[PDB]
Write a protein that binds this DNA or RNA. Sequence first.
RNA 1: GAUGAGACGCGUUUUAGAGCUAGAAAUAGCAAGUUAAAAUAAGGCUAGUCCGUUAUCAACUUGAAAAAGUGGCACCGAGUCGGUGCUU
DNA 2: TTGTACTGTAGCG
DNA 3: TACAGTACAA
Length: 1088
Amino acid sequence: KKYSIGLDIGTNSVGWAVITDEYKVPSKKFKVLGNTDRHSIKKNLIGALLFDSGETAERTRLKRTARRRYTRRKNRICYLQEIFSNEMAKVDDSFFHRLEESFLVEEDKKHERHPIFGNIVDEVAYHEKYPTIYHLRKKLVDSTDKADLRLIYLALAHMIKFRGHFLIEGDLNPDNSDVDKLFIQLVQTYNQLFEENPINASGVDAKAILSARLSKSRRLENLIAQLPGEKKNGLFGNLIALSLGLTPNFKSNFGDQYADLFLAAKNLSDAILLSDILRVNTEITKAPLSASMIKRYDEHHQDLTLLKALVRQQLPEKYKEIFFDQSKNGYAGYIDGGASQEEFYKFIKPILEKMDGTEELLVKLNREDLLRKQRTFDNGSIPHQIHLGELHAILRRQEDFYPFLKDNREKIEKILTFRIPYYVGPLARGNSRFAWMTRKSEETITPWNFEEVVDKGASAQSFIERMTNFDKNLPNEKVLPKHSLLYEYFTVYNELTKVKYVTFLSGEQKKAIVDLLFKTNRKVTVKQLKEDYFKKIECFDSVEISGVEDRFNASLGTYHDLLKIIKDKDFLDNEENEDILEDIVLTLTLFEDREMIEERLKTYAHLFDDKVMKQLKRRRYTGWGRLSRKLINGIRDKQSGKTILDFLKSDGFANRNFMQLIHDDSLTFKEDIQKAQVSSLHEHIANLAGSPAIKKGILQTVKVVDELVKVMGRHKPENIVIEMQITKHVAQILDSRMNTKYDENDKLIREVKVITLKSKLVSDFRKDFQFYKVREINNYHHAHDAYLNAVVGTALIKKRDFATVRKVLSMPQVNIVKKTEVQTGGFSKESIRPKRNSDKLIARKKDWDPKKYGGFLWPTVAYSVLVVAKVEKGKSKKLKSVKELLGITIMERSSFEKNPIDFLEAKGYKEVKKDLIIKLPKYSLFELENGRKRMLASAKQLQKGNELALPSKYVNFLYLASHYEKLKGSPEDNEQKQLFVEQHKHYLDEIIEQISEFSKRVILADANLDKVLSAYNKHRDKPIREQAENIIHLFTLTRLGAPRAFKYFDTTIDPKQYRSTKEVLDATLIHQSITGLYETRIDLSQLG
RNA sequence: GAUGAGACGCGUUUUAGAGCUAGAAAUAGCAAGUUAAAAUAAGGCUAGUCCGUUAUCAACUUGAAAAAGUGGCACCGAGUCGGUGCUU
DNA sequence: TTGTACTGTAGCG
DNA sequence: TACAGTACAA
């Protein structure tokens, strides 16, 4: 009557099995629908579900974010066009239209082919006068005469579109960029640090002595040569090296006294970077980025003509290969091909080594300066303030000439400078799953009127309530920051409570250790404890400490940070100010923009003010903690009256750890956790947590349990065995769904007992008693693993059977089911291919013909559709009937599901029989002659779908033949396995014949069969190890799935691809259930 | 560790940046090249500076959909399950 | 003009 | 690893 179900859940597989109380898997005659002759097939209640891995939403999030960025960039361009329209439309009637249709071929182009002027003479004059955009930018900055309005528009449109980063706040100044002033500040703070023997010095000429011309290690002698009173190994060399990112010997040169020197060295380093990002830097006043790129263009031109002359005169061989070929990573490949800067350097670098006199040019490669482009991967560090200043200079230079620039200077500057804040989110109207913003009005949001439309308080508060995460130990409670005061003091006390001294720590000792050392220094080591506390206070000469090895991993960074921003130390040591300080760290963790942070902290202005506020406004914290206030110093024990944290302060002689406070059942804390932890099936799965790779596994195993209950007359099991983010989720749902009855005195009736097991027990059961398994032979190991889970679980709850378990491990019929997916994702591969005459190119837009504009390729098929119809064939037309599959792609999926009939007559199929349209997803199973099974991978690709059910004794033979000397058991057992597997060595020559029969029956890969037979015969004499590993990889030939290229000793066998789905037109399609015990067999040969 | 927000720089694609000479030419020699526009999932309607690659999905009967319903047992054996016997 | 075989295709920090 | 591009059998 009663039965048990065993499960084994993985990321790609869910194994399931039914056992009785006699450890036997039942077999039942299952009814089969469809038009086939078969009405009932005998099936066993053991099998496994195979499925695709569940993906995280990350890639979707990146594509979403990028798509928003492109939309907003186009919107900025549209805003600038709207500003220009009223005047420039009088200047040039069709300028924006030409810039819009610049992409089109001339025959699609309604207006003239030249985008800017529309006349060839003025376009050539523009390109001669301004070969790059930077020349036009620099002229518009540096010219006082009346300029043409369209060129002004290209300048600001280039500047607004490609606007640079916002990693630096506020405005730029030479006080941060010019290295000399921060060097003066750094030497000033060093001198006030010691004042005995200072190196007093003026500013430094960093343009040679610290930037790329003598950067990194070279500055440690170049700058030292101007100040020989200090040295490269000295502390001045130390600060310069720290200003160059090196690791100097701080311990040899020498407390938070030196932290000022460290931070000033870091800001000096920042000054060198903002100097070196621009070539000209301080060498000229006008248009610094435009000037830098014009200089780069001039240097590129002269070095290019030098390089061409030198190649043409001294080594004319491969002159065409460099400058004409455009395929072998030459200069023509650098410009007209897809060769990077470093690839072009790497191509000509052995060349330049071979040629003579290249030294003056090769250093430009060694400095990465040679023939650089103006649009490069290195432009990512360009701040937006440079473009802002350039745009401001252009509008101030043309303010009086064009009045609408004077009326809209702040408008254009706001278009460039506006950033949607971290906390506002998307500017939706409720039609977004992600948006949380609250409007204070119902109108269009522009950057000019952003500050009077969004309710920043309500949007901010919603942002707090969404972004806050919730505690793993109690999911209803808000987490603290990882940089919270109580979080750091929690982990400091939790690390300190496991320290034992020999001459455990008591409460007063721990409190004094924290008050004299942890609340004084960032890093505390064992030597500091035994020297500054035990000898100083406890008067202990010799102390041995075993709790901590070298130093404490936890530290009070946040405490000393607050002690830095305000020096009112007793205020930090006051328990009344704890919640206020928690609110500040909650403020800086959540927000990154200065405005709303300023609004939140301004409430506390009546406690402290001025310099402390202006200082603390620059601090920011990142990350979030794993614990809540309501657990650390929250719930209280009934008998002791102490929390987690109160127990951490004092626990008598034996000190108890947070995990062991949870683990101990003698307190009410476990009860307090479990009574508060608890918080349609689709509605029930819609809220659960965990990684996507395992959530799929849980949902599919509960569905498998649903189908299994449906099979067995709705009778419940006696117990269900479950394998071990998911640590209670493994049981949670199935306890809730099986156990649905309760009484007034019994809180829950245990009709089904959910038994939890670890993989160590089942693996040890397998390793001890010769019931071995491998992954390469077949996917029967999942079902065998689950059935073994059921066996051991029932045996342990209860506590010829060995013959039964060996027979079940050697039963051939196991219901392997590959779950059938409609494919979802991007409908094509992302590389845009160039123009071609092929019709296979996918159009990138509705009006862009891919024969002229290129397009995408490799489309993805969501599912295939079997159609029977008449197709127009032949010059002398007649209507021939045909049955064939057609692959529906992801882009055509919706258009197919709106009206399948019209979509099929769009493709050439007429007189389509509508009722015989069958939907075939990926991994649709077809059966053919001699039991050959083929799996539909696409409309024009099949896959292997048959299992080689090799008897268990030979699988034992293969496992023992491998791992020949790495058992790590006992010598008697190891030598017994070796001699016992040597006594069966003829199993090798029988298993190769097993492979031959099964592959000749259902794989049909005869050339590959002869290849592996010849390679086996000519490698017969090699020993057990490497032979026994190569037969393991030959099961790739017989394994279900796509045909992969496996490899023998030396030869590599290419896969045999089944690129023909014509044979499944007459096969028997199997509609297999999630457990596969119910099937619907349709004989497609009777259709059409 | 799941999950979200805001940004930047590249890349790709088509076009614009007049190629010259010898040429019946299939072409040969030379010059030139660094930049810009437009798009970056086709598109969708509640038209938002929003959404569109995450999750979900055997077949049949009801139901717009949600969702519900849809398939006997015992024994002997085992090449992807077969056979024997009761039952409506 | 239609099927097969072999090799190459794939946008990130 | 599904699909593309080129190269042959009829």
